[PDB]
């Protein structure tokens, strides 16, 4: 949406349809307080994800990858989230009668 | 009826009644902080739907689906909206004696 | 009587009596926060009916009916109140020892 | 009395006599905030009558009944208060030994 | 007294003697809230008679009976209070040992 | 005393003698406030008698009686005040050992 | 002591020592607020005697008397005062031990 | 001492010796708030004595007694006091163990 | 000390020495407020003495004595205190272990 | 030390050291509010002595004795104090392990 | 970030990406609030490592460890941090299931 | 150390050191009040001893003693202060584990 | 860091690097209030060590140990802070696992 | 340190060095609010030592100990602290496990 997202979404909008340089498809299993993710360069500011704090560690590549794991169910949260350039691939598919997750995204996100 | 509906409607009115571009049949199993769905395309702001806060996730096509599924019962709720054209079909009969839900609608919705 | 009713009655007055057009026989089983039914076209503003929350859903014509059913009595709460033209024929006989349901109306509804 | 009687008699007084257009015979079993029935054609304003919130429902004439029955008892009330002529017949006896509803009324009415 | 009475008397006094125009015999079992009975034609303000508030009904001539029966003891409160002319005779004699109803009074009111 | 003798005397006094016009001997069971009776034909302004509020009701002459009468015991509490000439005699002996009754009045009374 | 007595005495004093005239003997059993009896023919303002709230009620003459019988004791008490001319003995002898009231009085009284 | 005694002495004092007239003797059983008692003619004002509230009441002379008696002692508690001449013996022997009564006086009293 | 000593000693002091004029030895059983005796011929003001309220009674002389008795002990209190002349021989001697009460003294008193 | 000493001492001190004329040996048993004793001739202001308020009494001289006796033990004390001359010889031995008394004194006192 | 980090996070963001001078991973088990470790040279302000406050104590170099041990699990939580030139490669895996810990960082940190 | 010492010391201080005269060696057991002892031949002002109320009394010479036992102890609390010269010695062994009161002094003492 | 440390680090920092002088290594065990230890030659101010209050007392040298031992572990707590030169080895290992203290220091110091 | 230490040091400082003149080495068994001890010569303002308030008594020399003894361990603390010259030497071992009083120190003090 904005830049920062800053949102609760509450739930999904409006996204405020793009090419997919500057809205990102943040969601996945979230809640824990992202603004947005991705962009802006600027303080989004930050999120949390996986509604945890946890979050992956290793340097994939300059960009490189966050991986809170949210349950013991499948939680492929991901956020490469370096800020250089970005690919991720989120899905999500836990208990399986859940608020559907099961729908899964990716995320694009050039800075440039 | 306005812009952004931003209504508990309570229920149903003196829709504004239109060619089907602006008013859309927002209704189906609802009443979890719609505003207005569709339109505008400005902020509704936003709705959560399904009286629950579970929606569709994949990416139909451009405009693309959600679905809250609200009980055990049929509960096809659809939101296509993405924000490009939009095409869904509700309709609606859970527990049979409910506040009559059976009665179904189909949405369109230009923002264009 | 005034455009919008606005009104519960408190009950039955001193009907502006008119021709059909402006004031309807909104009566039937009401009570839940209608003001007025019909007319004017600027907001009643709206009304529940049936002493419930339901109301019908599939479109009749452009004009389209609602019908909250009130008790498991006949309750034909019928308010084809789209905003086009508008024929709706109520009737009421519930509990048969009631506060006078008997009588039925018939509502003309020209906006035009 | 006045234009809308607007009163609680408290009880019947010096009725300011007449020929029988403005005021009429309310009179019957009353009580229910009723103001004036009959005249004025403006805002009596309204009345519930028969102690009650029944009323007549069917349209007689263009004028046309109104009757809750209060009691079990011989409860007639009638107010065939349209707002076009007018012509009721009261009675009253009901639990025999009761505050005098023996004595019953007819109600002229012109407006005109 | 004067015009309207407006009193409680508080018992009978020092009753301007007249002719019988203004001044009427009021009394006779009274006590609920009676201004004056009869006179004025302006407002007494009203009267309650019998002490109940019950009172006859049925129209004898123009001016017309009125009879609250007060207890089961002879209780023929009349007052033929039509605002034409205008007569009764009360009479009283109920709980033998009372506080002295049994002489009774007649009323005598021309308006004119 | 004065003209409305206005006074629980407290008990006699001073009477203001006089010739028998004025001043009348009001005296007898009294107590029930009697401003004063007889005089003056302006508001005396008025009293209950015999310590009840039962007073007689026949009329007598122009002039006609009142009699509460008190207690079981002797209580010919008579006041014939009418307001035009005026003859009434008072006696007294209740409970015998009293608070002395016994002495016995009669009151004129020219209001000329 | 002055015109009206208007005193408690508290009790004998300097009685202020004249011609019979103003002064009177007003003495005997006495307490129930007398101001002073007798004189002046202005209020005394009033007195109630004997302690009690009797007094006779006959006429003696013009002057005429009064008697509170105070207790059961011989309680002469007499104040013929009407405001004529005037006399009355007093003697007092109750319960023997009392406050001395064995001494007795005689009132004169001329107003004139 | 001063014209008005007016004073609990509180006990005898520096009594302001004279030749008989002003000042008198007024000791003996005494208390029952005497201000003075003999002069001055003007008020003392007044007194009690002998403690109680009993006094002679029959007339001696023009000055005559007054004989409050104390208790069931020998209590001549004499005070002639008219307001005339003025001679009056007083003497004292009550409970023979006192606070000391025994010594008696005489009262002169000119006021003259 | 002073004209008037007006003092509770507080015990002897400073006695301002003198000739036996002014100063009076007032000292034998004492406390009960005593300012001086004696002198002045002006209010002390005045004394009570032997801690009592008894004193004698009978006139000595033209000066006379009082004689308040203290306990059951030798008790002389004398004080002839008249405001004449004045002669008095006060000793002490009661509950032998006392405060010493032993000593006695006399009193002289010129006023003159 | 000063003229009226007014102290408690607290206890011995800097004693003005003098001739034996102004000071005096005031000590012995002593507390009881003793301000000075001897000097000045003006107000000490006055003492009481012997931690009693017991003084002899009789009149040794012009000057003359006084003497609380403290305890049952040895408690001469005496203070001849008249404000002539002024001999006096105390001496001190009571309880005999006591807040040493045993030193004894002697007092001149010439206030000339 | 900025120059001191004086963040806790919340968790990773934005990290301000860059050439590895200025931020640097300051990452590990941390918590224990550290602003920013590495940069600036000026006030992070502090930080205390290892969520303890243990720090290693030798010096390796000029710039030279310090290493709290969190829990017995591999708490390797080093920080070089001297303000020379600096090197530190931490790793981390405790408790296996954890908020992961598993991927590990290595800093540089030059000042110049 | 100043004139009056005026001092609890606490303890013993920077006796501010001199010739034998103003400053003396006040110590011994001590405590109760004593701003100084000794100089000046101003009010210290003054003191008590040996934390008692007891001190000698006979007088030694001019200058004298006074000697407040403190406890059963060796107790030799001397102060010869007269205010003349002065000669004392005190010494102090009592409960031999003390306060260490082991050392002694002697005071000198010229005012001059 | 700062000339006087004052600080609670919190924990080791930003070390402000130096050459030997101004900085020491003052860490070994301590807490107990150190503001800094060596520098300042100014009030650092002071520290007490060893989060104790013991510390050595003989002289070394001109500069000259303190050692609070801590616990009963090894405590060698020394700090030679004269203010002259200074040389102190500091080392630490106490409760084996303890919060690291196994490293150990040297202090040196020059003020000059 | 300053000329009044007037400290609690809280403990060994900064001392600042010096020649041995204005510093004295106050250090032993302390704590009881000695400011400093020694210098300067104007107030120190005192002290007490030995954590008690004994001290030496009797007088060395000009300069003369004192010597709280603190508890039953060896505590010799002197303080020759006359303000003379100066000479003590202090040590220190009670609780042998104590904080550490070990180290024993000496004083100089010249004030000169």
């Not at 307080?33 to 991705?38: C, F, G, K, S, Y």
């Not at 992956?56 to 794991?69: I, L, Q, R, Y």
């Not at 800020?83 to 440039?112: M, P, Q």
């Amino acid at each position: 949406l904005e830049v920062g997202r800053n949102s609760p979404y509450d739930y999904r909008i409006k996204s405020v349809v793009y090419n997919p340089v500057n809205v990102v498809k943040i969601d996945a299993v979230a809640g824990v307080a992202t603004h947005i993710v991705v962009a802006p360069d600027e303080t989004y500011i930050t999120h949390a994800f996986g509604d945890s704090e946890s979050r992956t560690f290793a340097h994939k590549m300059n960009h490189f990858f966050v991986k809170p794991k949210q349950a013991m169910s499948d939680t492929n949260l991901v956020i490469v989230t370096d800020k250089r350039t970005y690919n991720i691939v989120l899905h999500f598919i836990g208990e399986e009668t859940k608020k559907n997750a099961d729908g899964t995204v990716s995320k694009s996100f050039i800075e440039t």
